[PDB]
Design a protein around this nucleic acid. Sequence first.
DNA 1: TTTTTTTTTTTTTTTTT
Lengths: 272, 272, 272, 272, 272, 272, 272
Amino acid sequence: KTSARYMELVGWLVDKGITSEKQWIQEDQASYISFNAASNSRSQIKAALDNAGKIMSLTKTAPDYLVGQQPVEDISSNRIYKILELNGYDPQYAASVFLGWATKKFGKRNTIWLFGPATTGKTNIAEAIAHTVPFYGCVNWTNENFPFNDCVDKMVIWWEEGKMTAKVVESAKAILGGSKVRVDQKCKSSAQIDPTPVIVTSNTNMCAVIDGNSTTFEHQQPLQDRMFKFELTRRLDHDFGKVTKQEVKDFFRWAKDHVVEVEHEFYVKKGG
Amino acid sequence: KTSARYMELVGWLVDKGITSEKQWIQEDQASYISFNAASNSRSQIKAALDNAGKIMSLTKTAPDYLVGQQPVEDISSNRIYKILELNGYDPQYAASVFLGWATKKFGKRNTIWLFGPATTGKTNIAEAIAHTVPFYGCVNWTNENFPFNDCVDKMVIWWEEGKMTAKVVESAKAILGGSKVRVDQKCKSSAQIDPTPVIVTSNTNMCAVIDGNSTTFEHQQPLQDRMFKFELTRRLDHDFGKVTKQEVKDFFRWAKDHVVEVEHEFYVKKGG
Amino acid sequence: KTSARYMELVGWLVDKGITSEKQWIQEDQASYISFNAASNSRSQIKAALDNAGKIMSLTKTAPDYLVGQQPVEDISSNRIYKILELNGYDPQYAASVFLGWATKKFGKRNTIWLFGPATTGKTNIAEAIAHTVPFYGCVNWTNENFPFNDCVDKMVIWWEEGKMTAKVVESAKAILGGSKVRVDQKCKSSAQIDPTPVIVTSNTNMCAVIDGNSTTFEHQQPLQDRMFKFELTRRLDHDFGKVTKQEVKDFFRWAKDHVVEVEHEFYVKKGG
Amino acid sequence: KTSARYMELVGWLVDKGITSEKQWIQEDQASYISFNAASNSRSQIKAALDNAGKIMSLTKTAPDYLVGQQPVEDISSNRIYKILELNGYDPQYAASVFLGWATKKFGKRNTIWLFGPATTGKTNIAEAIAHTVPFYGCVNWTNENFPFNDCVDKMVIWWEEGKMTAKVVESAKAILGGSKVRVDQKCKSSAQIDPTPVIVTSNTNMCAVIDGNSTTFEHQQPLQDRMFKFELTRRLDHDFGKVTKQEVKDFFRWAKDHVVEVEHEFYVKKGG
Amino acid sequence: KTSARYMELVGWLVDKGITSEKQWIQEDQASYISFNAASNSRSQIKAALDNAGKIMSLTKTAPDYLVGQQPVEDISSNRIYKILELNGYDPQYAASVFLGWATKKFGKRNTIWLFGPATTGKTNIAEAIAHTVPFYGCVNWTNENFPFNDCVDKMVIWWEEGKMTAKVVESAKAILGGSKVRVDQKCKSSAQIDPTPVIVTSNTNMCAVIDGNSTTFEHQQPLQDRMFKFELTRRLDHDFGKVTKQEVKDFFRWAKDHVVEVEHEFYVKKGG
Amino acid sequence: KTSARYMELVGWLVDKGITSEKQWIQEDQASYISFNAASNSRSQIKAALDNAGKIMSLTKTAPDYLVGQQPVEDISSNRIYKILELNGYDPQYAASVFLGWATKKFGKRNTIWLFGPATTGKTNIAEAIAHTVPFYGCVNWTNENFPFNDCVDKMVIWWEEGKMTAKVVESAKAILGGSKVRVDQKCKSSAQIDPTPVIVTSNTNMCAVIDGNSTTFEHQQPLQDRMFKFELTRRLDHDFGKVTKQEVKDFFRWAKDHVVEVEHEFYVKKGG
Amino acid sequence: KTSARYMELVGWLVDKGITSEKQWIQEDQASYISFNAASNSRSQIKAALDNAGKIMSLTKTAPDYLVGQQPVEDISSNRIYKILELNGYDPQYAASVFLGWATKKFGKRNTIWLFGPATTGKTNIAEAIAHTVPFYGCVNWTNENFPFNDCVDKMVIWWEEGKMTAKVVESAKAILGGSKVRVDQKCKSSAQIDPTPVIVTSNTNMCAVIDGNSTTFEHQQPLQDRMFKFELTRRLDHDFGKVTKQEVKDFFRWAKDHVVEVEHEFYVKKGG
DNA sequence: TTTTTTTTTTTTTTTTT
């Protein structure tokens, strides 16, 4: 009276691919109600969801969720196209750089930073990128005792608040080049972080490592060599976002299709 | 077995719009009594009510109950228009601002602050609007530990007590500008907030942020540009309020039928 | 197995209007001991009592089950009128004020404050009134920063002894004129005190406010404008009172049988 | 099912001489093992004992179950007569005083205080009184935060050592005066102490009131008009006392037989 | 069958000389095997042993294990007699004092403080006297946070190292003077104490009181007027002692056979 | 079914060398779905895996898995061989030292301290060795309360970052050299550590002991006497990894085949 | 039901001499997994382990493990002869002293101490003696707050470090001197140690007693004239230790079969 | 046919400190 129920729940979770609570809430609430009525023991469903998430992360990496199964159709049918056109950035070169940074094959280069206002198509694009990947780590400096937290076995590490802290410079340097390092999470819990691309959204400077109560500038060369900086100037307009999933999938497919040459230096010569 | 019963209970809770035990006892009390008699474990009904509320907050909006299916076909039939012409404000402009702040037709601008003593009738209108929306929250800024405690998955955010706190200004600005944000809630909870229309009612100026024990003024530019400020000079009569749901529905219908353009401004003009 | 028992208990609690376990223990004993022997958890009885209290307070009021249909059949059949005449107060004016306080509709005026001897035959009357009505909030000075704690969901509120504090003055000011305001309570919790008619018994200067460690007289004009002062001087005999439900019902009936105009004012002039 | 067992247990606790854990263990020893074997849950027996104690303390006074139906025949039959002769008290006068103090007919003169060493025989009398009635309150002033700890819902209270503070003098004045009032007990809670007759046995002056950090005796007129003081002089002999129960019942019956006039003051006429 | 099994277990624990778990397993071993074969939860045997111990402590007392079963009438039949003769004490007077202190015929005086080395027979004799009785208390003054530990109704209260703390001296005085008292136990436990004979075995002056972190002699007069003094100025030979049950039985028999007079004062006045 | 399923799970854990949950998930993935479809009870599988891990840690060691099963084939063409040849380290001497430190043949010399930059290649080799073996401890120094982590019974104890502490220097010395000491974990329980080969990797000065809140070098003689210090300064190229289990097995087999008389000494000499 | 399982567990624990879960898993792991799969409750196993420990400690001592069960007739051949020749003491005299200390026939003389540098054959012999007997206490001085914590009802008290404290001097005197005494350990816990053999492993200032917050030698005589003290100088080699059980058994048999004269004195002559 | 409760494992604290 429990084996078949657990099997059906695991099958439904694998067929739907749930990652949180509101998702399954707006999806199909009949299975959840049936499970709650049959037994309030949420341990089984929690373990099943954890196993499903682990299998999806360790197997379905970032590119696995980037290559759209449908045809690319056209690149002009996405808001990112006109956004970059108004901002002024190379589409093919930017797509190639993003692919190289997400594939982790570049080596010590695995981090992108943006400098400019948030109204220039930054917050919307960051939210769209975070919502695209099903497993993403939203790291925030809400707890100074442990900065890095939700970012173990994920796909994209979002940095929308503050900058890189100085108390965990080793972890940041290891993640910049796709490496790993044992970092502490909550109270008594040291775990290793796997190679996961990081994207910044905060309107600050990634090089400005916050230490104690000021900024430190001692390892600017490695931070610049392991991170690609994109300057922002010309702001956007009104209602210049609303990035969906089909547009991102088509953009990723187009980027994977045509690939150009990419360098491996800080001073990126954007001239594709 | 219990799956059908749980599905029926969820459907009933969704169609009844229950928000707590009081509403459940007022509406259908037989189901609650039967569930309590069959088993004291209120975990099932609690989870069902939570899921129903989350679904209603993520799907239900304003036209579901704020806009009536049939308009009033007149103007001299509801005390709302009487109180409006007594206070002295633009009817079409006010309706447009209300529809833009509730239905969300722009983005940043998504807040309203109507100041008025306990005699101009604004308090009665605010209480009626709060009672209309069952899934609303009276986020009272009295407790200096967790202010935002009634704005997560709600219909309206009533601000009738207290001004603003300087400790959490980012979350307030994000809620005013229609977007998500993280608030330092409990020790093991801090999710985002869904874009919910916020209406102010306290006589104290909400723009004056309260920091610990002092008042700030530099943080007034965004608080003023992300909302519409209105003032009520003339009072009312002998108990003129207690607006019901039919009156609000008729007013919303009349607005949707007759609405001009919407302007982006903070200081209300002397017209209307 | 227990649905019938739960429904019977709920019906009995709604009929007898029981609010505490002591009342039910004193009244029905067969069903009580039967439920105790059956279910070893008081969750059912607690839920039944909560539902009964909600239906009696939120939906119902007090005079509905307080104004007995059996008139007094004469001018004065007890000693309440004799005590009132010995104290020195307006007859028709006092009756009108009492009817307005019981019904609540004569503007914001809905509170009485007594002052005089510490035993002017009022303690026994207050105790009898509290014992008769099933819903009564006894405001005690147990808490330091949160003195007001027995005013949410109640028919009448009684102020024992001690001067009003300054930590929660807005709640009292709102309850005086029927308004409401959300204030904090224990540790990490804020609620809105439901407006309820309040009566003060402490002869001390209740108009004064205890602010931290001083006596402020600022909150005096609104308190006097929203309340009626009763200056007590001449006391009664030895425990002159013994008010019962029948006496209160007869008084309410004889007062409703003859209603006159009301003179809203703070100073209750004894002469004329 | 368990209704019959619960009814039998209640009847036993009522008319079997069971009031505490030790008393119940000494009464029916096999009943405890039988109840433990029939059910491993002591909640039923705990609730039964609580209900029995409440019914015996609240509604049930004390003399009704401590006044034998047979006279004392001759006053020279117990050690109480010798103690009274050695101390100095009028037979009929003391009997009438005790009757009035136990019946609470004076309205406010329901208090007794003794001013004499422990060697006079006060300790033995207090021990006999405590052993007689099964229930009794024991107020210990060892902790200022919890003055009245053992006296809620009782018939006779015994003041061991220590004096009464000045933080809750109103509670003591209402208890000794034949009234009631909320009193702060443990867990920052407020309990109710009905007019329970109290008797003091310590040798220290009980008139001293500890207010904050001083000793004041302002409460003199009420303490004299609501209590009766008795000064002791002569002591007793080595190994004397050990008052039983039948002797107390016979003495109470003899006192009830001869009832005369009782004065109204603090210093009772020490004569006869 | 539960009641019959409980009664059989109680009878076995009573007629097998069982105190709890240690002695229960020492005397018999098949009881646990039978219990495991019948049931599994040790709560049954725990409650059985608790009830057996409570009954043994209530009914029987000290004399239950003092007088032997077979008369002997001889002073050279035990080692305690030779020890007391070598130390310099009258055998008849010592036996009379022991017989008078065992039954507690004096009342006020029921304690004797012994101060002397261990080679003369102090710690060994104390441990033998403590183990002679099945239920005994060990109020070892080792933790300032725990005044009286094991001593809730016992036959003999053995005191080893440590002195009474200036905070619960009244409880010790009442226990020594044949009376009860309430002493705080653990964080959530506190029971009274029954008048049980107490014997000290401190190597120093036990009359001293431990006040906070110093020594004070405030309660020395009561301890001197209610307790005798014993000094061990001599020393016995090596390889001696062993106070079995037959020795104590013969000693008590000889004491009861030879009864004289006992004096009451500070020092030990061996006059009889 | 329960016993058979538990036995099958234990056998699978012993065969596949399961240690954690994610490992078994990635390994025998069909077993998880089979157990979910058969029943719902993760406690059984958790206990089985815990018992299997405990057995493997208490019975197995390092040489049980370090020994290969076929010829080493490569002698100096592999990546590790090329790195060792370019670093100027003795191949045979290094292999003999590793065999003596892992196989426990040295006994008194079972500690290695690698000092130098991070790009030398020691960090990557240590991480690969830790990830290859199943059970392994990560004794880090992130908190000042838990000096050790999961080192109790393991194959290799990797010291990523941090330095030795002072509150428990005996435990660290016993874990490194191979002594004994009863370590005390939290305030609940504790346990010792089994002689497991420890390998250090932190580039910081490991000899710097953290005493309270300062740096002390008093506990350096034990390390100098029972530990070889190797200065790893010669950096490598740019991410030179690609380490498998077959290569490590071949290297261990070649080392075992080429073993002579290892020279014991703190500072590394020119014997290469 | 569980009678057969309990009997089987008791028989296995008595046969294999199991003293904990580790020993049970090492001797017979099949029954452990069988019981874990056929029953989740551990009450039966806990009771069996407690009974085994009681039977092995209470009804045992030191000499019980002296004369081995297998004759070997070994004298000078194992590492014991080498350690004796390196320490500089008479083998026959040392064996006789060890036998006398294990049998406890010298009254106060019941302890052995051996001073030396560090790894001078003392730690090896200490660890061998600790691992020989399956039941013993490891009174580690890692927590000076509770020294004598794990040694109650044991066979050998191992002292691998720390020094002698003044807070538990009575227990140490009773153990080394052969007596019994109760001492308070943790919060609400008293332990009584019996005359149990003690073996020291460290070479610290054992004579210096830690009193309050400093060192004192007040117990010079009680700590000197109560045990046999010896001095060492010549150390050993590397990997030349780890005394097994066969050598210890042979030495014990040789000492039991070869007994000479033992002089009662602390300052033992250098060379028996 | 016939039930329908074996303990359904009815669900569990606050603690573990």
